Structure 1
Amino acid sequence: KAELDRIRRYKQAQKKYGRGPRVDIKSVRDKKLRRTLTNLENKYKTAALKAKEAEILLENQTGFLEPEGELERTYKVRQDEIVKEVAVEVAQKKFELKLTELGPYTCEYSRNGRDLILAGRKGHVATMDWREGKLGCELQLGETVRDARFLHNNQFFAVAQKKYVYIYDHNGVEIHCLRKHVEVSHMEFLPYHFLLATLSISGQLKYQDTSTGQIVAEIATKHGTPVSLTQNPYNAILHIGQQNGTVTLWSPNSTDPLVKLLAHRGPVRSLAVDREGRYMVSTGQDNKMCIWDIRNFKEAVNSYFTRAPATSVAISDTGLTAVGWGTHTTIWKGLFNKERPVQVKVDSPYMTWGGQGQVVERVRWCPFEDILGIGHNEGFSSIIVPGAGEANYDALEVNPFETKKQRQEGEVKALLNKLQPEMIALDPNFIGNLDLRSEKQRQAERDLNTALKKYLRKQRKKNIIDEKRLKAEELYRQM
């Protein structure tokens, strides 16, 4: 019939924007509760339906490339062919920085992709606006540099020196150094909480609140130096990856790991985790990489193999992933589809960047454009890959063209809605659920032959006599 499209529309919107199963109105016994819950179910149904109908006003289109003939394959496509076939405002972004004498470089974009920071190993830390081509800062620092990271804006950044971390302003003037964070080898900035989480080489993980300036919870990961660290963008829990070959999930409200996904036989070399929090791809020292469903904590498919222990892996805003191993990175497209209940293995990579003798230190996706920045020992190299990048951003959350007034107002609103670090769990939507023990105690204070042998075995050891045990002795004598 003609209403079949209507029922399909409602099923699709209840899948996507529904955020829950539905309230069962037939089991409600109260009359006023029944009509108010029917009113609420009508309002939530039209809410999801109007969001799905207003998903037509999205402006941009997702990029792609598809092979035409039967012999042509997508991984044999050259960057010169992409640059010839693509528009000029996005063919401008395929550059290459040639910085040779100051260590392998480490790239990190800001979370709108306006400014990128690249840090050499021997000290050369620079901060540039890579589309407009101007550099905001460049400074040399002397000693080694473990990791450089932007903070909430492109105003402040944070560099991990030989002992401490240092946070710097937009001009590069050093605001301060953090002395509690010694020998920091990895850093990750939670964006919605204002926490900066640092793994030392000793295995200690410190969460420092950036806004107010006090370290929230120093967790000591009891086993080994950590090899890698990433951050779930959906839970804000930290997937750190150890050297015995397990990845452990950490949160500032517990000193034990939340889960520990057992992984590759050697140490895991790199991790990456989806921005919807669905799946995690990890690459180990044993040459395999493998993906996990995170919402169920099981392995999705068999282990893919990489032909070298992959130094970095970073997955995009859409389904693409760049796994950078040895001296050339490969991009895979369909590793984890959200819609499929049982995942299938991908035969061929989506596209491969060339191996011409520059060992890849770190690959990163520019968060809203369809490019990929590889930081290697010869410097920085930005390549363009069409399928990646979220085509339609939201101007309220994060904006690639944010003016000065919009940046000021957004920083103040993010300060006002910074989340307390005790609001971190495996499921981030728990706020308002039942304390079941407290509800059972409230209802209690409102309404007011195989185990009874191990009972006596446990209570003969106290040796309190405790009249319930006298009743249990009489029961055992009767038995």
Structure 2
Amino acid sequence: KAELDRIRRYKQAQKKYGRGPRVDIKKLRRTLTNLENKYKTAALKAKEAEILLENQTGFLEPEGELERTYKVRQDEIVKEVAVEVAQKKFELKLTELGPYTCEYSRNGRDLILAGRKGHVATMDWREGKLGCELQLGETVRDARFLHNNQFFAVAQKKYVYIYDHNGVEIHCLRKHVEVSHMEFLPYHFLLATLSISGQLKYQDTSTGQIVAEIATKHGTPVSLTQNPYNAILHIGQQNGTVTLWSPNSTDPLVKLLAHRGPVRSLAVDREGRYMVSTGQDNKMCIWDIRNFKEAVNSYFTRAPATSVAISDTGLTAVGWGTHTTIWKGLFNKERPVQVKVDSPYMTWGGQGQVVERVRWCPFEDILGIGHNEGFSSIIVPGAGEANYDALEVNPFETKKQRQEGEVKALLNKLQPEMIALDPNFIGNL
């Protein structure tokens, strides 16, 4: 009567948590009935312990038959939404020194805004605490935080310098020349760069020696992101291919036939299920990146999208030309056959400011847009995971938990030889 629903929660439990098929079935036989019963109750007690989660996720629903989600203005959201995050919808006007790259931390507590004419600043944006504002003179290609919000790295005109929390230059990285894109591997300590002449440089930022330099042969690179699930690294190449890399394999490890012009922008899920890119041939298409199978007939963008960035939930943020649109259901993880999103969701509008980089907050419901006149910050209710885990990533971390989390992370620096496509490969034959 209800044991059917008991088996239903058993099915969802061993889908989400069981992590494997199941061990089929003399001393070995009883030790594996032992192990299989302990694994069964382990998944079932994780599923039962999912009810203790504090926060619910944000949403907005079309209560009428004619009010639609892309029409809702942020005066309506800032009024109808609580005052602590209505604080977080702020803007910031900086005209004089170039288009402003922005990047958060991975707890969302700090952001760098780099400015291409030189102006690089690190801040705590909620409490208005400007930790650094360094002027830096010559041009700036990219800025990014390292493992904490305590060191950051900026890709200059010629080298890549890294800096402490006070904005004091600890050291210049000379071996990386005209780095145009950067990505930090966080479970490693592995600052990975693309130079303007197509050379991956994989460093370790803890030990300080470069660990795998490999010159990609596809000319100059035009895009770069990072799979959080695999630590593999997506460089976007101007023949139209998303070329997928590693420190180990000196060949491209897998390259996909994405577009026709240079593929302008890249993003992957933090769960590593899917991928979305866009290029000059203005289509923006997504892939089931595990099966390497384009799951959806491509979308179009009204302009070549200089940015895309997808959220901790399914929302994708494509920043095209001078105004950016969010897209909700591009890849439903639970659905076998992927259907097309017929209409967007929360377009941030165009009033004469070319957006140079879009970002999401990781655990807030805000989006940080990086235009030529500075940093604008907008609120969009669906994004950000509500429930975090303060063992891994803590948005409210004191100094004790910063120091403890840093030294536990250094004790669990994965080695650069541990990077592959399926990351649960360790312990096979």
Whether these two folds match at TM > 0.5 is yes
Partner of 1:391: 386
Q: List per-residue Cα deviations over 1:273-303 (Å, max 9, x = no partner).
A: 0000000000111110000001100101101
**1:45 aligns to what SS in structure 2?**
helix
In structure 2, how many angstroms separate the alpha carbons of the residues matched to 1:285 and 1:175?
39
**2:171 aligns to what SS in structure 1?**
strand
In structure 2, how many angstroms separate the alpha carbons of the residues matched to 1:195 and 1:220?
17
Q: List per-residue Cα deviations over 1:101-144 (Å, max 9, x = no partner).
A: 00000010000000111000000000000001110000110110
How far 1:342 sits from its partner (Å)?
A: 0.7
In structure 1, how many angstroms separate the alpha carbons of the residues matched to 2:22 and 2:169?
53
Count, aligned residues: 429
**2:41 aligns to what SS in structure 1?**
helix
* Structure 1: tracts of 5 or more residues without a match: 26-30, 433-477
In structure 2, how many angstroms separate the alpha carbons of the residues matched to 1:256 and 1:151?
27
**2:416 aligns to what SS in structure 1?**
coil
Matched, 1:348 2:369: no
Partner of 1:19: 19
How far 1:155 sits from its partner (Å)?
A: 0.3
Partner of 1:423: 418
Partner of 1:62: 57
Q: List per-residue Cα deviations over 1:64-87 (Å, max 9, x = no partner).
A: 000111111010000000000000
In structure 2, how many angstroms separate the alpha carbons of the residues matched to 1:301 and 1:420?
35
**2:42 aligns to what SS in structure 1?**
helix
Q: List per-residue Cα deviations over 1:427-475 (Å, max 9, x = no partner).
A: 111010xxxxxxxxxxxxxxxxxxxxxxxxxxxxxxxxxxxxxxxxxxx
In structure 1, how many angstroms separate the alpha carbons of the residues matched to 2:71 and 2:43?
42
- Over the matched positions of the two proteins, sequence identity in percent amounts to 100
In structure 2, how many angstroms separate the alpha carbons of the residues matched to 1:261 and 1:42?
42
Q: List per-residue Cα deviations over 1:307-361 (Å, max 9, x = no partner).
A: 0000000000000000000000000000000011110000110110010000010
Greater per-residue strand proportion:
2
In structure 2, how many angstroms separate the alpha carbons of the residues matched to 1:141 and 1:69?
52
**1:241 aligns to what SS in structure 2?**
strand
Spell out the pairing of 1:271-286 with structure 2 (5 A cutoff): 271-286=266-281
Runs of 4 or more consecutive aligned structure 1 residues displaced over 6 Å after TM superposition: none
Q: List per-residue Cα deviations over 1:198-230 (Å, max 9, x = no partner).
A: 000000000010000000010110111000000
CA RMSD of aligned residues (A): 3.0
In structure 1, how many angstroms separate the alpha carbons of the residues matched to 2:201 and 2:121?
26
Q: List per-residue Cα deviations over 1:138-191 (Å, max 9, x = no partner).
A: 011011000000000000000000000000000000000100000000000000
How far 1:4 sits from its partner (Å)?
A: 1.0
Partner of 2:252: 257
In structure 2, how many angstroms separate the alpha carbons of the residues matched to 1:136 and 1:20?
46
In structure 2, how many angstroms separate the alpha carbons of the residues matched to 1:371 and 1:199?
29
How far 1:411 sits from its partner (Å)?
A: 0.2
- Out of 173, 195, 202, the residue aligned to residue 197 of structure 2 is 202
Q: List per-residue Cα deviations over 1:400-423 (Å, max 9, x = no partner).
A: 000000000000000000000000
Spell out the pairing of 1:354-369 with structure 2 (5 A cutoff): 354-369=349-364
Matched, 1:376 2:368: no
In structure 2, how many angstroms separate the alpha carbons of the residues matched to 1:143 and 1:128?
21
How far 1:2 sits from its partner (Å)?
A: 1.6
**1:14 aligns to what SS in structure 2?**
helix
In structure 1, how many angstroms separate the alpha carbons of the residues matched to 2:137 and 2:2?
71
Using the size of structure 1 for normalisation, the TM-score is 0.89
Partner of 2:81: 86
In structure 2, how many angstroms separate the alpha carbons of the residues matched to 1:43 and 1:62?
32
Mark the structure with the bigger radius of gyration.
1
**1:186 aligns to what SS in structure 2?**
strand
How far 1:11 sits from its partner (Å)?
A: 0.3
In structure 2, how many angstroms separate the alpha carbons of the residues matched to 1:91 and 1:70?
27
In structure 1, how many angstroms separate the alpha carbons of the residues matched to 2:55 and 2:331?
24
In structure 2, how many angstroms separate the alpha carbons of the residues matched to 1:283 and 1:64?
27
In structure 2, how many angstroms separate the alpha carbons of the residues matched to 1:271 and 1:223?
17
How far 1:61 sits from its partner (Å)?
A: 0.4
- Out of 163, 167, 171, the residue aligned to residue 172 of structure 1 is 167
**1:74 aligns to what SS in structure 2?**
coil
In structure 2, how many angstroms separate the alpha carbons of the residues matched to 1:73 and 1:168?
46
**1:65 aligns to what SS in structure 2?**
coil
In structure 2, how many angstroms separate the alpha carbons of the residues matched to 1:153 and 1:51?
30
In structure 2, how many angstroms separate the alpha carbons of the residues matched to 1:153 and 1:71?
46
In structure 2, how many angstroms separate the alpha carbons of the residues matched to 1:35 and 1:183?
61
**2:214 aligns to what SS in structure 1?**
strand
**2:127 aligns to what SS in structure 1?**
coil
**2:77 aligns to what SS in structure 1?**
helix
In structure 2, how many angstroms separate the alpha carbons of the residues matched to 1:158 and 1:52?
40
In structure 1, how many angstroms separate the alpha carbons of the residues matched to 2:24 and 2:76?
56
**2:230 aligns to what SS in structure 1?**
coil
Greater per-residue helix proportion:
1
In structure 2, how many angstroms separate the alpha carbons of the residues matched to 1:268 and 1:249?
13
In structure 2, how many angstroms separate the alpha carbons of the residues matched to 1:105 and 1:197?
21
In structure 2, how many angstroms separate the alpha carbons of the residues matched to 1:92 and 1:204?
42
How far 1:238 sits from its partner (Å)?
A: 0.3
**1:227 aligns to what SS in structure 2?**
strand
In structure 1, how many angstroms separate the alpha carbons of the residues matched to 2:266 and 2:329?
17
How far 1:375 sits from its partner (Å)?
A: 0.4
